[PDB]
Design an enzyme around this catalytic site. Structure first.
Site, PDB file in Angstrom:
ATOM      1  N   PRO A  34       0.829  -1.221   0.000  1.00 31.40           N
ATOM      2  CA  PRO A  34       0.000   0.000   0.000  1.00 31.40           C
ATOM      3  C   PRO A  34       0.864   1.272   0.000  1.00 31.40           C
ATOM      4  CG  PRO A  34      -0.565  -1.515   1.864  1.00 31.40           C
ATOM      5  CD  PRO A  34       0.787  -1.939   1.302  1.00 31.40           C
ATOM      6  N   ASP A  35       0.297   2.345  -0.545  1.00 28.89           N
ATOM      7  CA  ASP A  35       0.896   3.688  -0.438  1.00 28.89           C
ATOM      8  C   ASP A  35       0.393   4.312   0.864  1.00 28.89           C
ATOM      9  OD1 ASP A  35      -1.804   4.631  -0.885  1.00 28.89           O
ATOM     10  OD2 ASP A  35      -1.236   5.377  -2.908  1.00 28.89           O
ATOM     11  N   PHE A  36       0.544   5.616   1.019  1.00 29.69           N
ATOM     12  CA  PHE A  36       0.122   6.199   2.260  1.00 29.69           C
ATOM     13  C   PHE A  36      -1.238   6.820   2.213  1.00 29.69           C
ATOM     14  CE2 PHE A  36       3.834   5.869   5.032  1.00 29.69           C
ATOM     15  CZ  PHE A  36       4.865   5.606   4.104  1.00 29.69           C
ATOM     16  N   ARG A  37      -1.545   7.477   1.086  1.00 34.54           N
ATOM     17  CA  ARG A  37      -2.550   8.499   1.042  1.00 34.54           C
ATOM     18  C   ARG A  37      -3.756   8.123   0.152  1.00 34.54           C
ATOM     19  NH1 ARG A  37       2.561  10.870   1.951  1.00 34.54           N
ATOM     20  NH2 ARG A  37       2.481  12.163   3.836  1.00 34.54           N
ATOM     21  N   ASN A 108      10.948   5.077  -1.397  1.00 28.73           N
ATOM     22  CA  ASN A 108      10.481   3.780  -0.880  1.00 28.73           C
ATOM     23  C   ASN A 108      11.529   3.053  -0.088  1.00 28.73           C
ATOM     24  OD1 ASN A 108       8.146   4.408  -2.269  1.00 28.73           O
ATOM     25  ND2 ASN A 108       8.474   2.878  -3.968  1.00 28.73           N
ATOM     26  N   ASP A 110      11.056  -0.407   0.338  1.00 27.74           N
ATOM     27  CA  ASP A 110      10.739  -1.803  -0.030  1.00 27.74           C
ATOM     28  C   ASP A 110      11.961  -2.485  -0.715  1.00 27.74           C
ATOM     29  OD1 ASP A 110      10.514  -0.991  -2.915  1.00 27.74           O
ATOM     30  OD2 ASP A 110       8.463  -0.328  -2.546  1.00 27.74           O
ATOM     31  N   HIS A 127      14.805   7.608   1.682  1.00 22.69           N
ATOM     32  CA  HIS A 127      14.217   7.293   3.002  1.00 22.69           C
ATOM     33  C   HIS A 127      14.826   6.079   3.697  1.00 22.69           C
ATOM     34  CE1 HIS A 127      10.425   9.925   2.083  1.00 22.69           C
ATOM     35  NE2 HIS A 127      11.522  10.623   2.264  1.00 22.69           N
TER      36      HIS A 127
HETATM   37  N1  LIG Z   1      -1.355   2.134  -9.190  1.00 18.75           N
HETATM   38  C1  LIG Z   1      -1.151   3.473  -9.218  1.00 18.75           C
HETATM   39  N2  LIG Z   1      -1.090   4.133 -10.365  1.00 18.75           N
HETATM   40  C2  LIG Z   1      -0.900   5.485 -10.435  1.00 18.75           C
HETATM   41  N3  LIG Z   1      -0.701   6.217  -9.336  1.00 18.75           N
HETATM   42  C3  LIG Z   1      -0.722   5.636  -8.119  1.00 18.75           C
HETATM   43  C4  LIG Z   1      -0.980   4.216  -7.990  1.00 18.75           C
HETATM   44  N4  LIG Z   1      -0.990   3.908  -6.658  1.00 18.75           N
HETATM   45  C5  LIG Z   1      -0.750   5.071  -6.002  1.00 18.75           C
HETATM   46  N5  LIG Z   1      -0.641   6.091  -6.857  1.00 18.75           N
HETATM   47  C6  LIG Z   1      -0.338   7.458  -6.520  1.00 18.75           C
HETATM   48  O1  LIG Z   1       0.949   7.397  -5.904  1.00 18.75           O
HETATM   49  C7  LIG Z   1       1.016   8.494  -4.980  1.00 18.75           C
HETATM   50  C8  LIG Z   1       1.451   7.906  -3.621  1.00 18.75           C
HETATM   51  O2  LIG Z   1       1.460   9.034  -2.741  1.00 18.75           O
HETATM   52  P1  LIG Z   1       1.825   8.843  -1.231  1.00 18.75           P
HETATM   53  O3  LIG Z   1       0.906   7.749  -0.765  1.00 18.75           O
HETATM   54  O4  LIG Z   1       1.906  10.198  -0.552  1.00 18.75           O
HETATM   55  O5  LIG Z   1       3.309   8.226  -1.144  1.00 18.75           O
HETATM   56  P2  LIG Z   1       4.731   8.970  -1.410  1.00 18.75           P
HETATM   57  O6  LIG Z   1       5.744   7.877  -1.637  1.00 18.75           O
HETATM   58  O7  LIG Z   1       4.563  10.100  -2.381  1.00 18.75           O
HETATM   59  O8  LIG Z   1       5.271   9.869  -0.241  1.00 18.75           O
HETATM   60  C9  LIG Z   1       5.209   9.161   0.892  1.00 18.75           C
HETATM   61  C10 LIG Z   1       6.357   9.750   1.683  1.00 18.75           C
HETATM   62  O9  LIG Z   1       5.576  10.228   2.761  1.00 18.75           O
HETATM   63  C11 LIG Z   1       5.790   9.465   3.949  1.00 18.75           C
HETATM   64  O10 LIG Z   1       6.416  10.398   4.869  1.00 18.75           O
HETATM   65  C12 LIG Z   1       6.900   8.497   3.643  1.00 18.75           C
HETATM   66  O11 LIG Z   1       8.126   9.175   4.046  1.00 18.75           O
HETATM   67  C13 LIG Z   1       6.879   8.409   2.134  1.00 18.75           C
HETATM   68  O12 LIG Z   1       8.143   8.092   1.509  1.00 18.75           O
HETATM   69  C14 LIG Z   1      -0.398   9.093  -4.863  1.00 18.75           C
HETATM   70  O13 LIG Z   1      -0.412  10.221  -5.747  1.00 18.75           O
HETATM   71  C15 LIG Z   1      -1.289   8.024  -5.478  1.00 18.75           C
HETATM   72  O14 LIG Z   1      -2.375   8.554  -6.279  1.00 18.75           O
HETATM   73  N1  LIG Z   2       6.716   1.200  -0.730  1.00 20.69           N
HETATM   74  C1  LIG Z   2       7.321   1.792   0.291  1.00 20.69           C
HETATM   75  O1  LIG Z   2       8.498   1.558   0.565  1.00 20.69           O
HETATM   76  C2  LIG Z   2       6.530   2.754   1.077  1.00 20.69           C
HETATM   77  C3  LIG Z   2       5.130   2.187   1.596  1.00 20.69           C
HETATM   78  C4  LIG Z   2       5.438   1.188   2.696  1.00 20.69           C
HETATM   79  C5  LIG Z   2       6.071   1.971   3.969  1.00 20.69           C
HETATM   80  C6  LIG Z   2       7.052   3.005   3.530  1.00 20.69           C
HETATM   81  C7  LIG Z   2       7.244   3.372   2.201  1.00 20.69           C
HETATM   82  N2  LIG Z   2       8.137   4.410   2.161  1.00 20.69           N
HETATM   83  C8  LIG Z   2       8.477   4.682   3.449  1.00 20.69           C
HETATM   84  C9  LIG Z   2       9.385   5.551   3.929  1.00 20.69           C
HETATM   85  C10 LIG Z   2       9.569   5.711   5.281  1.00 20.69           C
HETATM   86  C11 LIG Z   2       8.863   4.888   6.166  1.00 20.69           C
HETATM   87 CL1  LIG Z   2       9.139   5.111   7.952  1.00 20.69          CL
HETATM   88  C12 LIG Z   2       7.962   3.942   5.622  1.00 20.69           C
HETATM   89  C13 LIG Z   2       7.811   3.834   4.280  1.00 20.69           C
END
Ligand SMILES: Nc1ncnc2c1ncn2[C@@H]1O[C@H](COP(=O)(O)OP(=O)(O)OC[C@H]2O[C@H](O)[C@H](O)[C@@H]2O)[C@@H](O)[C@H]1O
Ligand SMILES: NC(=O)[C@H]1CCCc2c1[nH]c1ccc(Cl)cc21
Ligand SMILES: [Zn+2]
Length: 273
Positions: A34-37, A108, A110, A127
């Site tokens: 899963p993503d976060f948001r 990420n 992962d 990260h």
């Molecule tokens: N299958 C998909 N296809 C297209 N877009 C996607 C899909 N799944 C997700 N998205 C988009 O992918 C985006 C995911 O946004 P976020 O969930 O904020 O993750 P982050 O990696 O940017 O930032 C998270 C940082 O915040 C935390 O502090 C950690 O430090 C993280 O590293 C959204 O726009 C979704 O619409």
């Molecule tokens: N797919 C991922 O690696 C993402 C989503 C899984 C949890 C996670 C990701 N990024 C991160 C950055 C910092 C911390 Cl503490 C957690 C995560």
């Protein structure tokens, strides 16, 4: 306004030869992480069983110091080893084999960029990583594999020197980024194409990196939505390919004429996996 085809032509010509790539959690949702948001499926919206003060706490150091158990239960679910790279990760790998990848910056943890076969020298794990761990009390480093068994057995790992809780070298929210991230000031002025995949571009200093390339450089976003500086500070050479990230990547790959070579590479790496 450039089209996705224009970008693919630029790459085919080797007019863009130093591609910087920025990615986030959205590139690994197709792998089952899963993503976060995202509404409904994002990590933020599914944490009730952990009884936190607020969702973000499970990735915060002060909360971790109070109670590391919720983080480690979650980390067991997320721990690398069985998730596999998807077509997004393999597209980046193919950029690298074609000698086009200047650097891949990922938010990420992962590890799937390394698994897909991108060399460490081409990656900035902004990260951090589960590949190493640190005592949160004495600062003693450990090989990340040293805590795998405890994490898989639902035990909090403890430092055999001081008994402090050992944490993987993940960058908890608002903690200092790793020394390797300091390469951003060398790479972004050299980029001749910026590709952004699967990130909401909410979190800084990472999001402002989209502004750090030259104004003449195209910025291609492949994401569900138009986000961050590409929504609020658009430039004339921006391209947005909105929709599922795997379909977006496959559309670009086809315009590149790399469909067969991708199919080939994915089949080969799957076997090795
Ligand atoms: N299958 C998909 N296809 C297209 N877009 C996607 C899909 N799944 C997700 N998205 C988009 O992918 C985006 C995911 O946004 P976020 O969930 O904020 O993750 P982050 O990696 O940017 O930032 C998270 C940082 O915040 C935390 O502090 C950690 O430090 C993280 O590293 C959204 O726009 C979704 O619409
Ligand atoms: N797919 C991922 O690696 C993402 C989503 C899984 C949890 C996670 C990701 N990024 C991160 C950055 C910092 C911390 Cl503490 C957690 C995560
Ligand atoms: Zn210790």
């Amino acid at each position: 306004k450039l089209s996705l085809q224009d970008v693919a032509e630029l790459i085919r010509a080797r007019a863009c030869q130093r591609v910087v790539v920025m990615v986030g959690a959205g590139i690994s949702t197709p792998s089952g992480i899963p993503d976060f948001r995202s509404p409904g499926s994002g990590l933020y919206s599914n944490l009730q069983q952990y009884d936190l003060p607020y969702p973000e706490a499970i990735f915060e150091l002060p909360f971790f110091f109070h109670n590391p158990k919720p983080f480690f239960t979650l980390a067991k679910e997320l721990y690398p080893g069985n998730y596999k790279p998807n077509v997004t990760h393999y597209f980046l790998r193919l950029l690298h084999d074609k000698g086009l990848l200047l650097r891949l910056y990922t938010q990420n943890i992962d590890g799937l960029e390394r698994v897909s076969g991108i060399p460490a020298s081409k990656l900035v794990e902004a990260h951090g990583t589960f590949a190493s761990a640190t005592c949160t009390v004495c600062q003693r480093p450990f090989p990340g594999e040293d805590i795998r068994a405890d994490v898989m057995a639902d035990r909090v790992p403890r430092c055999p020197v001081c008994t402090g809780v050992v944490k993987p070298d993940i960058v908890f929210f608002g903690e200092p980024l790793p020394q390797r991230f300091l390469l951003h000031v060398v790479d972004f002025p050299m980029a001749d194409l910026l590709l952004i995949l699967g990130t909401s571009l909410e979190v800084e200093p990472f999001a402002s990196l989209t502004e750090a390339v030259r104004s003449s450089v195209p910025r291609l976003l492949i994401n569900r939505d138009l986000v961050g500086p590409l929504a609020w500070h658009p430039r004339s050479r921006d391209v947005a390919q909105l929709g599922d990230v795997v379909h977006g990547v496959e559309s670009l790959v086809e315009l590149l004429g790399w469909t067969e070579e991708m199919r080939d590479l994915v089949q080969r790496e799957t076997g090795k996996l």
